[PDB]
Design a binder for this molecule. Structure first.
Ligand SMILES: CCNC(=O)[C@H]1O[C@@H](n2cnc3c(N)nc(NCCc4ccc(CCC(=O)O)cc4)nc32)[C@H](O)[C@@H]1O
Ligand SMILES: CCCCCCCC/C=C/CCCCCCCC(=O)OC[C@@H](O)CO
Length: 292
């Protein structure tokens, strides 16, 4: 429907603007050019690609255009790769924060500039590995829905391009949900809990205040991640566990897809926005750089 399209396009607009703003800030401000903010930048970059590429492809995938099955499958896989890199590089921020607060004596030695770039390379490789798996044969292209293609006015040699028609639900539940949503979530939760509880126990005051700040920033990332990603993936479980049941309605599918993309506007933007150094650099960019 047209409401889904517009909202989805508005999300794409917000995700580019905010995440360019994050990247711009690190580029200009010398005080922000540390290892931590490289994970912030990488995640922001992955978000820009979600806005420019993933979301327009996702709309098509969710509304339906005519295409060859493997071309239709390729576009779906592309959405998966880009949204996943968005997830993994955000997880890299959380892990960085764990090593910073809990193991400071090994932080600079362990999380070097070289290994930070290595970590981000691993994120993209995992994203391609997981995202493109259906291209290897774990897909529904062997049984094209020829009756649906007709109703959609698709030519022969083409199918109606719909995500769930080509990407199997067993892949989405057993592989994608586990590797991309559940594991990162639970990891980010475990990192948050440890920092949170350790900070409460001590409650010198400067290190403690930092620890509280980190906890609340990690709570927001985890809270929003779960809010944005769980609804869609939980729905995916329901479809998989009862494929005979009547499908979750179109409006619910759309809202859930929309929520998952909203993650790219809020993560890691709010994290950065909560660092006062970023917050003042943002104001500097708007007030001074663009306005004069
Ligand atoms: C790495 C993780 N990324 C993702 O999950 C990304 O993939 C996409 N997506 C993940 N599941 C899904 C998923 N079930 N359906 C779709 N679209 C198709 C929507 C749709 C479903 C069913 C029906 C028939 C309804 C009926 O019988 O009456 C019509 C449209 N996209 C997904 C999202 O864009 C997400 O951001
Ligand atoms: C933390 C990451 C988790 C990794 C575990 C991933 C492995 C899980 C294994 C699941 C068993 C299912 C594999 C079954 C492979 C099925 C491939 C196929 O021929 O297509 C069937 C589909 O078209 C049906 O819709």
């Amino acid at each position: 429907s047209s409401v889904y399209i517009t909202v989805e396009l508005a999300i794409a607009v917000l995700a580019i603007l905010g995440n360019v703003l994050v990247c711009w800030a690190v580029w200009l401000n010398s005080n922000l050019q540390n290892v931590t903010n490289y994970f912030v930048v990488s995640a922001a970059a992955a978000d820009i690609l979600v806005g420019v590429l993933a979301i327009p492809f996702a709309i098509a995938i969710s509304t339906g255009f005519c295409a060859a099955c493997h071309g239709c499958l390729f576009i779906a896989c592309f959405v998966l790769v880009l949204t996943a890199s968005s997830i993994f590089s955000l997880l890299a921020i959380a892990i960085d924060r764990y090593i910073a607060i809990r193991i400071p004596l090994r932080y600079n030695g362990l999380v070097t500039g070289t290994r930070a770039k290595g970590i981000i390379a691993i994120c993209w490789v995992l994203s391609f590995a997981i995202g493109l798996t259906p291209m290897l044969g774990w897909n529904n292209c062997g049984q094209p829905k020829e009756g649906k293609a007709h109703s959609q006015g698709c030519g022969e040699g083409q199918v109606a391009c719909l995500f769930e028609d080509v990407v199997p639900m067993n892949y989405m539940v057993y592989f994608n949900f586990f590797a991309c949503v559940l594991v990162p979530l639970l990891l980010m939760l475990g990192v948050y809990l440890r920092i949170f509880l350790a900070a409460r126990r001590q409650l010198a005051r400067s290190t403690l205040q930092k620890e509280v700040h980190a906890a609340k920033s990690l709570a927001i990332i985890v809270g929003l991640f779960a809010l944005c990603w769980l609804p869609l993936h939980i729905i995916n479980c329901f479809t998989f566990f009862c494929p005979d049941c009547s499908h979750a309605p179109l409006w619910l599918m759309y809202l859930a897809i929309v929520l998952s993309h909203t993650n790219s506007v809020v993560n890691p933007f709010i994290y950065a926005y909560r660092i006062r150094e970023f917050r003042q650099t943002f104001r500097k960019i708007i007030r001074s750089h663009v306005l004069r």
